[PDB]
Nucleic acid binder design. Structure first.
Length: 757
DNA sequence: AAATTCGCAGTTCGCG
DNA sequence: CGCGAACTGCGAA
């Protein structure tokens, strides 16, 4: 199993390293034969002799073109002849590439910005994380001595905890009477012991939570101060910090540093991403939080250190547990994308698609288009029409079916061969024309992206069928993650086409996909009403809800299945409408906002405040109780009684302050805000206290009793003290509860006059 | 930091 | 000083 690749430099020459785990044995393979390169498109041939002359400088010495090779490659489906330029060292490429593009004779250059070690994985057809090799894993966390202001890492590390299959332990340098605590004499000896532990356990994966930006940088600063060689790498190296945007990421050579924080935030949507919040979300069990100030007071007063050690132990324990949950999924993602688990775990959707496509392009001799320059980026700013959304029939409905397209946008892409290399091709025998927008797509040959996407959808179906007859529960799970990631990958192509930064950007393709989508959904709606007497209650992009106005449940169901037979015979190729589900009742508030209930009693909610992480728990809970009484019992009265009991409790100040907290993310640098709403007002005051606020920080605030601008009465919930300040019962009644439930009850005629207290 | 568009809805401010 | 538009956040698909 390949874990990762990198290179080093020996006498000015690059040496690839392949990090592997085979039969339980760590191994490093070395390759001294791989030559860096890029491509150049010239206007003639006699221009190559001049171009080889081109040179630059980096490390004092001169940079030159090692050798040149004329090759034939497809570009956007059309054959092209390009000059491949080889160099001695990968860093030669950034140094000389601009001057070689500057040359009058060179039209363009390509594939000049692919990191050498990823180029190697691609060109050699190597795939990380293949096979069934069990990886040894180790989580760790630290507890530090924090003081207001100071300097980062001015205080010592107080404890280091770790956890794996053998359990969780804490290393510390004060006596703590707990069986999982190992006591040493100083900070230096505690770190040294942790190094020894890592070295003895020899894990393939080190799991942290935010280790990319806290844990490793803390250790690094302390290790310099204490004169420690922090040689976590399997090659004796120290952890390597890389800049990644405005933050950082940390590699440990020969190992995989798996920071759960970027994985979790991209994978689940939570109102906050503290480790306690994530543990509870994923596993449904609370985890106690111990705050910095208590840690510090405990250590400085020598009192109550057991609480601190237990907290530190639990950090490591749950980090290991979250690691076991998420690492298998990311390992399947690494294998699917063909890049290291380290990279893939820290990548966005867009980047994952590009790496997948770069590899497929190499396999098919397809030259990669470049990332857009500034002038091209500006030209990529126009938008286009998206999904079709019907104005809904507001109200409470019974016996409704949801019918939806299976993989609408991928279906369209493959059925109509929608690709930048098939767009407006000249001299083809057959074409498909996008409705409304009119782009023509050649059908004579499979398009680059359509063919890949067809392979993906077919592999996913084969996996799903194998999964049913797989006895081994573990293997079944792995197949589940693989099939799960293929679906997310397949569903990213539409968006990628419209992504201005994408190499295979194609606006005409993006808008032809949505045009076709609108056509098929609207055609299907027209037919079900006109031909089968259904009434379409609500439709958004790729499915709709419908019922037969006066009909029975069995009638709507049976007639739905009949309509599917009818319509699927009319739909071309891979397009397919399916019977998603039957729902006894549904309530449709507005576009994008509804809730439905299946026969078993499960309630599915879309867009409503219940599912928004920026509304108070009291509003959400109350709306969910109103909807349950309506959907589950069709009992309007009981609903109104629920709202009245809630407004009374708020009026009396009986509602737990915790349920009043509003969580809103800071989306930008605090200086960039044009206007300042409450969460911004709060964030600014915290910055002013020296609290750090970066984009992505979640502000959790409560509105205090008072009048005027809400932002002036809002405070961080942690500063809330019931003895000093009362919450604003009026705000939560008038701005949270009533608006959310009111928009539902207006359909039964009830006023906002009602119901109050 | 980065897949897209379609959409609702709260807070604040400034127009007239 | 009412009211609507600007800015804002997040969901949906």
């Amino acid at each position: 199993m390949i874990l990762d690749t990198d290179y080093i430099t020996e006498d000015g020459k690059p040496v690839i390293r392949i990090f592997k785990k085979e039969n339980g044995e760590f191994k490093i393979e070395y390759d001294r034969t791989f030559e860096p390169y890029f491509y150049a498109l010239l206007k003639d041939d006699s221009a190559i002799e001049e171009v080889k002359k081109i040179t630059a400088e980096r490390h004092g010495t001169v940079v030159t073109v090692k050798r040149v090779e004329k090759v034939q490659k497809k570009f956007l489906g059309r054959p092209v002849e390009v000059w491949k330029l080889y160099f001695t060292h990968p860093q030669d490429v950034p140094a000389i590439r601009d001057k070689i593009r500057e040359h009058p004779a060179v039209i363009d250059i390509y594939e000049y910005d692919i990191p050498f070690a990823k180029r190697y994985l691609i060109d050699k057809g190597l795939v990380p994380m293949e096979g069934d090799e069990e990886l040894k894993m180790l989580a760790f966390a630290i507890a530090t001595l924090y003081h207001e202001g100071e300097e980062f890492a001015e205080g010592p590390i107080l404890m280091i905890s770790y956890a794996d299959e053998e359990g969780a332990r804490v290393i510390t340098w004060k006596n703590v009477d707990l069986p999982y605590v190992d006591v040493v004499s100083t900070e230096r000896e505690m770190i040294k012991r942790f190094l020894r532990v890592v070295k003895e356990k020899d894990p393939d994966v080190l799991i942290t939570y935010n280790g990319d930006n806290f844990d490793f940088a803390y250790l690094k600063k302390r290790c310099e101060k204490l004169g420690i060689n922090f040689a976590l790498g399997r090659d004796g190296s120290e952890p390597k910090i890389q800049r990644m945007g405005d933050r950082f990421a940390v590699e440990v050579k020969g190992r995989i540093h798996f920071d759960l924080y970027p994985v979790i935030r991209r994978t689940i949507n939570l109102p906050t991403y503290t480790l306690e919040a994530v543990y509870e979300a994923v596993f449904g069990q609370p985890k106690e939080k111990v705050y910095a100030e208590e840690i510090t007071t405990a250590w400085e007063t020598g009192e109550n250190l057991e609480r601190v050690a237990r907290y530190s132990m639990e950090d490591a324990k749950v980090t290991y547990e979250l690691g076991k949950e998420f690492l298998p999924m990311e390992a399947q993602l690494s294998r699917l994308i063909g890049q290291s688990l380290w990279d893939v775990s820290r990548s966005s959707t867009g980047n994952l698609v590009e790496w997948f496509l770069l590899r497929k392009a190499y396999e098919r001799n397809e030259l990669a288009p470049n990332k857009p320059d500034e002038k091209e980026l500006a030209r990529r700013r126009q938008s286009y029409e998206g999904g079709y959304v019907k104005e809904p029939e507001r109200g409470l409905w019974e016996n409704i079916v949801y019918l939806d397209f299976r993989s609408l946008y991928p279906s369209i892409i493959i059925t109509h061969n929608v690709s930048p290399d098939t767009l407006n091709r000249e001299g083809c025998k057959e074409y498909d024309v996008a409705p409304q927008v009119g782009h023509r797509f050649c059908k004579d040959f499979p398009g680059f992206i359509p063919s890949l996407l067809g392979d993906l959808l077919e592999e996913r179906q084969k996996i799903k069928k194998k999964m049913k007859a797989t006895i081994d529960p573990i293997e079944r799970k792995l197949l589940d993650y693989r099939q799960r990631r293929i679906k997310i990958l397949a569903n990213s192509y539409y968006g990628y086409y419209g992504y201005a930064r994408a190499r295979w950007y194609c606006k005409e393709c993006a808008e032809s996909v949505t045009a076709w989508g609108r056509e098929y959904i609207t055609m299907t709606i027209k037919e079900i009403e006109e031909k089968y007497g259904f009434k379409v209650i609500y439709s958004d992009t790729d499915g709709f809800f419908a019922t037969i106005p006066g009909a029975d449940a069995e009638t709507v169901k049976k007639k739905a299945m009949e309509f599917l037979k009818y319509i699927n015979a009319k739909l071309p190729g891979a397009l397919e409408l399916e019977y998603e589900g039957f729902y006894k009742r549904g309530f449709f508030v507005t576009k994008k906002k509804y809730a439905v209930i299946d026969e078993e009693g499960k309630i599915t909610t879309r867009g409503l405040e219940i599912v928004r992480r920026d509304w108070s728990e009291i509003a959400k809970e109350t709306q969910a109780r109103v909807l349950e009484a309506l959907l589950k019992d069709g009992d309007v009265e009981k609903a109104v009684r629920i709202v009245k009991e809630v407004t009374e409790k708020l009026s009396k100040y009986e509602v737990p302050p915790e349920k009043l907290v509003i969580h809103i993310q800071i989306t930008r640098d605090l200086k960039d805000y044009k206007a300042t709403g409450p969460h911004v007002a709060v964030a600014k005051r915290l910055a002013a206290r020296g609290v750090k606020i970066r984009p992505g920080t979640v502000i959790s605030y409560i509105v205090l009793k008072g009048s005027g601008r809400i932002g002036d009465r809002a405070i961080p919930f942690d500063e809330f003290d019931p003895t000093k300040h009362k919450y604003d019962a009026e705000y939560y009644i008038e701005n949270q509860v009533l608006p959310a439930v009111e928009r539902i009850l207006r359909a039964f005629g009830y006023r906002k006059e009602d119901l109050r207290y």
